[PDB]
Design a binder for this molecule. Structure first.
Ligand SMILES: c1ccc2[nH]ccc2c1
Ligand SMILES: c1ccc2[nH]ccc2c1
Lengths: 10, 226, 226, 10
């Protein structure tokens, strides 16, 4: 699943 | 003093990033393109963190945050290169250790793209672009990036309005000599859009040709549907 | 009353042009594309005549007049289609006798391009774009078209300034409820630039494939170096 | 020679 989504959830 | 949003964006500004081209690797188009894509992958991480500081951004849906960044990332990268280059002549400061002249652009297959970036530089030099104006235009470019996938059209318009208001307030206080300076700054956004879209197309084609290694986040942003 | 430049551009507005698709020719992508390119060739003639009415345009060098038109022609064509379409739903009014729905766009290979034109329509419907604003943005798009070939950079900046001033004056008088409306209108120009550049690329490729006949002026504008 | 130039010279 998305690295962009992972970094937005930090 | 001046506008609080503008002050807030100045403190949110990421730290400088070095390119660190590999001194063991012979100079080549592949080396130059690899170095630039690696630098962009690293800058993308800090852009995501920066966007969260923009008032109202983190209150959008994660889908809308992704859409804005998927449409604007290359404009944000290019405006950085442009700002770093304003005190230079016919040279693009990708990083303090990676300054590209016309020969290097030709060697990397980037002459047409880097010439368009230098057209952005030329216009901002004539306008005497300030750091306050640069950070405000980066945020406006993110908000105004025209994703076709926005869920909350009204919330994204309100974010545009908030950041436009900050630019207009800034200019009304700092630049009384030119009451239309905010609009002149807004009128620079079409060339940024044009140059960004060319760069995404150019690097997408490098991705398809398969000769330049690219990291996960950079590839995610290149592959986004726009 | 209001702003004289805005009044002058309204009277300079060309007359409507019919598409006149050939009723003897079976419907096809080739027919649709031929009809659109023939209509654009005819509208290009009146755009050249229209630009001469814009204060200061005819005082530029013929080279600079050519450069501005070679960069802006497709933005001027698209803003016309957009304006004609504001009272319609999911349909583009190329001409009163040539209204393209989604099926026709798919049949012509224009779905992605026409969807981006409909994104321009959607934004201008929400802003309630007025004819006065449309004609002023057409002139600003011509002046602000970012040709890399400009001889007199200062004279072209002064033309931008004159037309920006006209928009800002118009909005200050007609739209006191929204003091930032002129800047909102300026913020629509990046999507027009983006859509224009896609359209030029799309029709350039149709030109190379050689299956759609194109007239002399249209081909001159497609072949221009940008 | 250019049709665009010809029409600008009218
Ligand atoms: C285009 C391509 C690569 C890049 N790395 C940093 C900025 C930038 C712009
Ligand atoms: C794109 C292509 C062809 C066109 N004819 C009239 C407007 C227009 C836009």
């Amino acid at each position: 699943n998305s690295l962009l989504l992972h970094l937005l959830k930090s | 003093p001046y506008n609080k949003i503008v002050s807030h964006l100045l403190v949110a500004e990421p730290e400088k990033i070095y390119a660190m081209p590999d001194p063991t690797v012979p100079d080549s188009d592949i080396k130059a393109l690899t170095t630039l894509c690696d630098l962009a992958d690293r800058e993308l991480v800090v852009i995501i963190g920066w966007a969260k500081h923009i008032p109202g951004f983190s209150t959008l849906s994660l889908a809308d945050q992704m859409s804005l960044l998927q449409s604007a990332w290359m404009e944000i990268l290019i405006l950085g290169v442009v700002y770093r280059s304003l005190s230079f002549e016919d040279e693009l400061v990708y990083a303090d250790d990676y300054i590209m002249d016309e020969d290097q652009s030709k060697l990397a297959g980037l002459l047409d793209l880097n010439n368009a970036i230098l057209q952005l530089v030329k216009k901002y030099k004539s306008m005497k672009l300030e750091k306050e104006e640069f950070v405000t235009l980066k945020a406006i470019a993110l908000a105004n990036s025209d994703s076709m996938h926005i869920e909350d059209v009204e919330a994204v318009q309100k974010l545009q309005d908030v950041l436009h208001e900050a630019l207009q307030d800034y200019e009304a206080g700092q630049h009384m000599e030119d009451p239309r300076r905010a609009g002149k700054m807004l009128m620079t956004l079409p060339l940024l859009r044009q140059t960004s879209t060319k760069a995404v197309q150019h690097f997408y084609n490098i991705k398809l040709e398969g000769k330049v290694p690219m990291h996960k986040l950079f590839l995610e942003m290149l592959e986004a549907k726009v």
